[PDB]
């Protein structure tokens, strides 16, 4: 057998997939995951894939710190060869999903811009929780907007999923939004939403 290598956590909105190399040649893999003090749970038994969905184990506690390891077994079938993953803490490290502007509405001399609730893989009682359900006050949304006839850009920030911004009357404005966890120093922002204009 050969040991797995380049083990990498791919995780967005808690959908979390461990990836590794190499493509198997006369070997198969099984993955195990644990927390530092907990038991090892096996996943992806004898797979020929070079990936393993671990979402269902990590959503049980997103604030825990998980370690995974990938075992290599020779085809047809001591301790096996294996490689450990980086540690992963999902609340701290999951990517924030690309957001969508849900609506905008002219009310007064102002425009409300509403961000669609971002759905995550964490379940509560047959429902997927939103990013704001999971992160609460650690999550903000940021709005990049401009008046088309002007140079330069404006930004607003919200603790909810809505922005109420002042606009000059009879003018068109375009908008784009990001999810942000300001307390992070790495992977602090989603990609920008598609741009929507009046």
């Amino acid at each position: 057998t050969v040991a797995a290598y380049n083990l990498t956590w791919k995780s967005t909105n808690f959908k979390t997939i461990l990836e590794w190399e190499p493509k198997p040649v006369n070997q198969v893999y099984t993955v195990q995951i644990s927390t530092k003090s907990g038991d090892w749970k096996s996943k992806c038994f004898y797979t020929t894939d070079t990936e393993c969905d671990l979402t269902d184990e990590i959503v049980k506690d997103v604030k825990q710190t998980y370690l995974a390891r990938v075992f290599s077994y020779p085809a047809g079938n001591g301790e096996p060869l294996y490689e450990n993953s980086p540690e992963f803490t999902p609340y701290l490290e999951t990517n924030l999903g690309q957001p969508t502007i849900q609506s905008f509405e002219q009310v007064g001399t102002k425009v409300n811009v509403t961000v669609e609730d971002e759905r995550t893989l964490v379940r509560r009682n047959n429902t997927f929780l939103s990013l704001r359900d999971v992160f609460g006050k650690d999550l903000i949304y940021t709005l990049y907007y401009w008046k088309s006839s002007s140079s330069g850009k404006k930004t607003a920030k919200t603790n909810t999923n809505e922005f109420l911004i002042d606009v000059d009357k009879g003018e068109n404005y375009c908008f784009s939004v990001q999810a942000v966890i300001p307390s992070r120093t790495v992977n602090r922002k989603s990609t920008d939403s598609p741009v929507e204009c009046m």
Partner: protein, 142 residues
């Protein structure tokens, strides 16, 4: 996006880009600014990665930049919801849910067994003592 009589008006994002497909330069002429144009184009030209319907087993797809996320029904997992939880009843998966011993039976269901001093309950997995002091239990607690 060219048909000559339809080209008579000044630029319109609605006309050029939302009712029709526009090229990067057409969008640039509308937005003018480099970063405003970039912000729009990065998403507009990205495509819907959910269009190929990658989520299996009744999962739901959400589009992202050059990527998607599948949200699975409870009985499924995997990047594309391809793994049936119901088909993973095997001994290396949490001891096949057996309390004590687990035996794989290929083609058919695994079975559960017990150590001497115990017998297998009607439930097919759980074990009960058949003697006063079975091995491996601490009676002073119970």
């Amino acid at each position: 996006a060219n048909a000559f009589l339809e080209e008579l008006r000044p630029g319109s994002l609605e006309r050029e880009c939302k009712e029709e497909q526009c090229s990067f330069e057409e969008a640039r002429e509308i937005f003018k600014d480099a970063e405003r144009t970039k912000l729009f184009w990065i998403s507009y030209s990205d495509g819907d990665q959910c269009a190929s319907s990658p989520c299996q087993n009744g999962g739901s797809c959400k589009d992202q930049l050059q990527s998607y996320i599948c949200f699975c029904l409870p009985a499924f997992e995997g990047r594309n919801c391809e793994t049936h939880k119901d088909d993973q009843l095997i001994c290396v998966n949490e001891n096949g849910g057996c309390e004590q011993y687990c035996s794989d039976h290929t083609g058919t269901k695994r079975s559960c067994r017990c150590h001497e001093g115990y017998s297998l309950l009607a439930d097919g997995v759980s074990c009960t003592p058949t003697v006063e002091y079975p091995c491996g239990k601490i009676p002073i607690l119970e």
